[PDB]
């Protein structure tokens, strides 16, 4: 047991396509190379007692317990290590269902490929599987304490590398719409789309959310002043820094009752709702000042009515939720003492940051509130009527949300949209206190309490007493208005011998159109006319630089075999995928020992072409031409021999080929021939003396033609491109 190499693949790869996240391990089996499980005494029993859940694994037999039957028959341990890694990272709550094992050319090393949901979790599971299997083959069993330690480490790794619920909702919507998404490395920011079409979100703030609006929302008094200047019904009140100002502030609001609350507070930190006398007023001021970080508090008039949260996205009301505080109803002739834990036994109850409906937490503050309620633990509710536990009405404590989106008055919708626009927030959460959201806020004495930037919408996607609202869908609609993804044209060039020249020629041709081209070659990564980065810059680590640049409109990526083998492709799909040739020259590196394996590896580019894209293949190369099948999207052939039977048959039914017919670089669009240049006026061809350069020019011209680039631009770019 020695781990030679541990690679992680993040995109389409040699092992699979549509299985982007994989881990590949080179495992040495020095002393246990060619002995089966049946040859190992007690291995099956120890394995099946350490991990009984392996009984679920449907192997190639395809029946329940098929993997266990295979273990009974006796096979190599690579398969069982794959299976135990899969089950080990699946027991931690990460469902994975892909695995492979292969014997390498070298005498002892195997290759094990395991699907993962989390990169660190997948690597840790791969590392733990070999230790578990070695311990079973050495001692016949694995300690349960070590199994629990590994499982809890996997769970901790999963939790650590996890987004917050708003971010999964938005990312899942983007995935459903086919919008590419990547994780930036600065502040848990997510980038959607590519190049000039990209957007950024953190949790709910987008890259278009204004600093001024966010900072105004966080200022309670400033928000109240601005809304009052706009005619919005805000509560009447004033600030009071010291104790001596309490009276003078109380007579300002217009009598009793009043509300006392800190201005540097959130989530109800030390806020008192209802007070009707001076003793309550002074206790309230003291408590709020203790909760205040700057010893400053606000008094205001108390407004009766239910508390509603209104979500406004892109100036439109998306969801309205009424927040009912923790309460119990004794319609079953039962008192609070039973219902407090009767509700706690509901499977809907859940702590943490995933389950929104938090269990009813009975604290000493809650005991004080229920003492103020006027009833006791064993006081049966009258007539089976709602009796409350607190007044903050927050889901973080055990309250509930009721969907009211379909009941809001149109005038209220207009007013709340206007409020969101006045504050200056693209996504806003407005807190309203009103007796009836179905009536305008002027008839009833409804008020706008506060406006929150970056609101959480987990209460709107699971109201628990109404219809869920597609908030993430509205956010994605705001970010990408039409049926538009954030993609830019991507041209991925692969092949054994002409990648760099073709990539540079493609970039030069596209530069003729007024577009900024970001292209990576072996020489370095360029954006437009300037060098963005030096070095090799051929793997996905340089593709991310191009795809994340806010000025790049078209990406041209040289995709060598090394990057695909090491970490797969840097993108899920490409608009154009060019395969120039496949020749067995540098053979034996990695697990690539046959030219068929090299063709399979280079076919990843061709197979990753989107259904609306094009695969530009060399019809003259049999291995490259064989990639015509298993390709989604159209196929365009290029050939230095104009009499290629496959190319001619392809052009007869359809078209889109490129040939070198009579000293001419020509595009065949079916029955039509469009000549670009005489191939002696193209400098790189060296007056037509370099057939390789002519083939590269053919591929580049066909690739740009498939994307609608006009013939004159292709001609100018081909004539002005100098070999360098």
């Amino acid at each position: 047991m020695k781990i030679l190499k541990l690679q992680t693949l993040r995109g389409p790869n040699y092992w699979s396509i549509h299985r982007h996240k994989l881990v590949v391990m080179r495992l040495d089996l020095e002393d246990l190379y060619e002995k089966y499980t049946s040859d190992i005494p007690g291995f099956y029993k120890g394995l099946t007692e350490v991990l009984p859940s392996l009984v679920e694994h449907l192997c190639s037999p395809g029946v329940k317990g098929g993997f266990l039957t295979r273990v009974e028959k006796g096979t190599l341990i690579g398969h069982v290590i794959e299976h135990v890694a899969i089950e080990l990272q699946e027991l931690a709550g990460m469902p994975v269902g892909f695995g492979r094992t292969r014997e390498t050319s070298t005498t002892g090393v195997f290759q094990v490929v395991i699907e993962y949901e989390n990169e660190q979790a997948g690597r840790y599971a791969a590392r733990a599987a070999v230790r578990l299997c070695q311990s079973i083959v050495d001692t016949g069993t694995y300690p349960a304490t070590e199994l629990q330690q590994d499982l809890e480490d996997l769970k901790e790794l999963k939790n650590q590398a996890s987004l917050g619920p708003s971010t999964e909702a938005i990312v899942k919507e983007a995935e459903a719409r086919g919008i590419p998404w990547t994780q930036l490395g600065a502040r848990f920011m997510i980038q959607f789309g590519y190049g000039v079409n990209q957007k950024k979100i953190q949790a709910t703030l987008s890259n278009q959310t204004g600093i001024l609006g966010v900072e105004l929302a966080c200022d309670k008094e400033g928000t109240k002043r601005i809304l009052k200047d706009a005619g919005v019904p805000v509560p009447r009140g004033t600030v009071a820094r010291y104790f001596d100002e309490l009276q003078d502030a109380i007579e300002y609001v217009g009598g009793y009752p009043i509300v006392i609350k800190p201005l540097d507070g959130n989530h109800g930190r030390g806020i008192t709702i209802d007070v009707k006398n001076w003793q309550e007023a002074e206790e309230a001021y003291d408590l709020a000042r203790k909760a205040s970080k700057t010893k400053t508090v606000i008094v205001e008039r108390y407004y009766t009515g239910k508390d509603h949260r209104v979500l406004v996205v892109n100036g439109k009301v998306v969801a309205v939720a009424e927040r009912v505080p923790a309460h119990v109803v004794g319609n079953g002739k039962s008192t609070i003492a039973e219902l407090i834990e009767e509700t706690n036994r509901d499977p809907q109850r859940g702590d943490g940051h995933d389950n929104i409906l938090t269990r009813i937490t009975v604290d000493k503050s809650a005991l004080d509130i229920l003492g103020k309620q006027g009833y006791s633990i064993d006081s049966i509710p009258l007539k089976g009527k709602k009796c409350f536990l607190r007044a903050t009405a927050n889901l973080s404590t055990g309250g509930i949300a009721v969907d009211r989106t379909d009941e809001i008055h149109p005038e209220n919708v207009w007013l709340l949209s206007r409020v969101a626009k006045i504050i200056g927030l693209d996504i806003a959460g407005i807190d309203v206190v009103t007796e009836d959201i179905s009536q305008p806020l002027r008839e009833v004495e409804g008020v706008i309490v506060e406006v929150n930037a970056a609101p959480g919408f987990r209460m709107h996607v699971a109201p628990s007493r109404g219809l869920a609202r597609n908030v993430a869908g509205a956010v994605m609609d705001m970010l990408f208005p039409g049926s538009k993804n954030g993609r830019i044209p991507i041209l991925s060039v692969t092949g054994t011998n002409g990648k760099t020249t073709t990539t540079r020629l493609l970039a030069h041709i596209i530069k003729q159109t007024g577009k900024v081209v970001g292209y990576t070659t072996t020489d370095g990564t360029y954006i437009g006319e300037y060098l963005a980065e030096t070095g090799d810059n051929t793997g996905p680590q340089s593709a991310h630089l191009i795809l994340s640049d806010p000025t790049v409109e078209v990406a041209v990526l040289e995709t060598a075999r090394g990057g695909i083998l090491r970490s797969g492709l840097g993108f899920s799909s490409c608009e154009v995928g060019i395969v120039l040739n496949v020749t067995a020259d540098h053979l034996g590196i990695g697990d690539i020992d046959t030219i068929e394996q090299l063709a399979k590896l280079k076919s990843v580019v061709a197979e990753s072409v989107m259904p609306k894209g094009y695969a530009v293949l060399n019809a003259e190369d049999p291995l490259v031409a064989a990639m015509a099948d298993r390709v989604k999207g159209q196929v365009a052939y290029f050939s230095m021999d104009p009499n290629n039977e496959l190319l001619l048959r392809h052009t007869e039914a359809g078209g889109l080929a490129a040939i070198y017919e009579n000293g001419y670089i020509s595009i065949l669009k079916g029955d039509w021939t469009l000549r670009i240049e005489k191939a002696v006026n193209v400098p790189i061809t060296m007056a037509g003396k370099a057939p390789f350069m002519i083939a590269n020019a053919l591929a580049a011209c066909l690739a740009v033609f498939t994307q609608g680039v006009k013939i004159e631009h292709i001609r100018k770019g081909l004539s002005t491109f100098v070999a360098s």
């Binding site: 959130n266 930037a453 970056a454 609101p455 959480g456």
Partner: peptide, 4 residues
Amino acid sequence: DDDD
């Protein structure tokens, strides 16, 4: 702050 965050998820207000």
